[PDB]
């Protein structure tokens, strides 16, 4: 059971008046545990999961100080990027950043990341070896030359392989009751007649965690994708996820169809067949 910790940062410039809108969220696997919203009254990093509330004042003061420093960097970036791309000061732009680390099944460092986007497109990203950079264009190339000279990769590598992993493990233990528990999907099938000769079978997977999952339809033991529909995995709102897959079949032939559900919380894949 590998795990990860990730931080997402979004900054939107507001030329009309004031500073950029800055929003940061932290996640452990698919569980959000912190957030910061420059628009909120506290102006502090805030908890979003019970198990992070255990952390003392020093934790929250440090995280708050650091996240504010992040917003200022993004504020500066928005200006620097406006220049690089020779853009007007009147339009609103967006800088996004994501970084974090994964620990493998051995609970040891597996991989780290640190990527950046401008107006929704890759800008610059730390490569897997955590020593080189991927720059999407010439604006990002100038940034890359600057970060190489300042040895930014070395400083990040230290955090991603050390601090990042250490805290991820700390959080995993503190919130083990949920973070190290898998919630198997609760499944069932519904039947809806769409005509006198056709019917829709919908296979449901509810209240599962983590979000990763696979739903597949088979007809007489073989995968079928035509006449099917699978919606994107969506949050239930209570920390778990939902998904469904449907297939249109000839009324009276429902029995030939089986829905297959694969999920980490299942010792073996589940197979559903209509009544």
């Amino acid at each position: 059971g590998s795990h990860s910790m990730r931080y997402f940062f979004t900054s939107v410039s507001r030329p009309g008046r004031g500073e950029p809108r800055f929003i940061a969220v932290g996640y452990v696997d698919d569980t959000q545990f912190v957030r910061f919203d420059s628009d909120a009254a506290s102006q502090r990093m805030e908890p979003r999961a019970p198990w992070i509330e255990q952390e003392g004042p020093e934790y929250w003061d440090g995280e708050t100080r650091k996240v504010k420093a992040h917003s200022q960097t993004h504020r500066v970036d928005l200006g620097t990027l406006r220049g690089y791309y020779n853009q007007s000061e009147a339009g609103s732009h967006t800088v996004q950043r994501m970084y974090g680390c994964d620990v493998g099944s051995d609970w040891r460092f597996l991989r780290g990341y640190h990527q950046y986007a401008y107006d929704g497109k890759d800008y610059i990203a730390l490569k897997e070896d955590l020593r080189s950079w991927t720059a999407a264009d010439m604006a990002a190339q100038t940034t890359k030359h600057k970060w190489e000279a300042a040895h930014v990769a070395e400083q990040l590598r230290a955090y991603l392989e050390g601090t990042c992993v250490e805290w991820l493990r700390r959080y995993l233990e503190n919130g083990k009751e949920t973070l190290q528990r898998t919630d198997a999907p609760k499944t069932h099938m519904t039947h809806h007649a769409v005509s006198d000769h056709e019917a829709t079978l919908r296979c449901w997977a509810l209240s599962f965690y983590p979000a990763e999952i696979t739903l597949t339809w088979q007809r007489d033991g073989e995968d079928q994708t035509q006449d099917t529909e699978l919606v994107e995995t969506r949050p239930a709102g209570d920390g778990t996820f939902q998904k469904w897959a449907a297939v249109v079949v000839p009324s009276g032939q429902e029995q030939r169809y089986t829905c297959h559900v694969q999920h980490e919380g299942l010792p073996k894949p589940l197979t559903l067949r209509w009544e």
Binding site: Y7, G26, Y59, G62, E63, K66, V67, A69, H70, T73, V76, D77, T80, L81, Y84, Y99, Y116, Y123, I124, T143, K146, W147, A150, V152, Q155, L156, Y159, T163, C164, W167
Partner: peptide
């Protein structure tokens, strides 16, 4: 826990 130093673009 967040990273400490943030380098600018």
């Amino acid at each position: 826990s967040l990273y400490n130093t943030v380098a600018t673009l």
